[PDB]
Amino acid sequence: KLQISNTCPDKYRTKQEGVEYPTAKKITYYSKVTETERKMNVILPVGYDENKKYPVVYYLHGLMSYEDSMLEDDSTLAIPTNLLKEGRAKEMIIVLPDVYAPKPGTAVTPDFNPEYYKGYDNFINELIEVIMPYMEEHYSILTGRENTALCGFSMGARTSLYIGYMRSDLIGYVGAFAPAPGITPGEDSFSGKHEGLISEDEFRAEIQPIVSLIDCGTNDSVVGQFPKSYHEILTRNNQEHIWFEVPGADHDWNAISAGFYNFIQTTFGALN
Numbered sequence: 001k002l003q004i005s006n007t008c009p010d011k012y013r014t015k016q017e018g019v020e021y022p023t024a025k026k027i028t029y030y031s032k033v034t035e036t037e038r039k040m041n042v043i044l045p046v047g048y049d050e051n052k053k054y055p056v057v058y059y060l061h062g063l064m065s066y067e068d069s070m071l072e073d074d075s076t077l078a079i080p081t082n083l084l085k086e087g088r089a090k091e092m093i094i095v096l097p098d099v100y101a102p103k104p105g106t107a108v109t110p111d112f113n114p115e116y117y118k119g120y121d122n123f124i125n126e127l128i129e130v131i132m133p134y135m136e137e138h139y140s141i142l143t144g145r146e147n148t149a150l151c152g153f154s155m156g157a158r159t160s161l162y163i164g165y166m167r168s169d170l171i172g173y174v175g176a177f178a179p180a181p182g183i184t185p186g187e188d189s190f191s192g193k194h195e196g197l198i199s200e201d202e203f204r205a206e207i208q209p210i211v212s213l214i215d216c217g218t219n220d221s222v223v224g225q226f227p228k229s230y231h232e233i234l235t236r237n238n239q240e241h242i243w244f245e246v247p248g249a250d251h252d253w254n255a256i257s258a259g260f261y262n263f264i265q266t267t268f269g270a271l272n
């Protein structure tokens, strides 16, 4: 019963008086991938009961951000609770990683350059080898692709699409809010040639995402027409997905909240 909306109503992205919201806890954990101690926020659902098990959404920030950045607007914490209260989302655990996970010897200062991007690309290893096992060991989670969502903004949305299609066996639900250039070959004004992580014909999955969703503002000054280009390539490749544009929005929380609002309505069987 999917009804995509091109904006998030204020009442779903705002904390409502008299409603309890979950809180983030910052976790420090060791990564064999970066060979360093790293941080992530874990947001347990209201009333978290260790004798229950919960599905998990991993939500990835953009370039030059960090694990608290998706908490700077209340949509992240408010939307899943506000949908839950209307029976339109499932109870879930939300994880906000630090997505910049360079191998030792390759950490560089944030900037629009290929060497800095490599640390985001390496997040596929951080997520699968370190963060997912940590969550299974330390929290009462549901495992399996039907219980696992991955979404992100801008560079984190590029990274979500890359991981969600290359390892669709692990990730049931993929959400990409204004994804950055360079999943596939391309060229832009911020850093010139992007060689592409994969070719366009390779941007596909053997086992299909249960849900793949992509959005973007119509006037995004940072990633421009790249999200639309991904829609077009996925369509050419017969990859089922949802695409929509947020009218007049830029690289901003209107585009993000619209994406997350539609995405969380689909995750974990919420539509039955």
Ligand SMILES: COc1cc(/C=C/C(=O)O)ccc1O
Residues within 6 Å of the ligand: 061, 062, 063, 064, 112, 117, 153, 154, 155, 156, 180, 181, 182, 188, 190, 191, 192, 222, 223
């Ligand atoms: C990978 O190349 C790019 C990444 C971005 C990401 C911006 C963001 O995450 O806010 C913007 C322009 C680029 O050329």
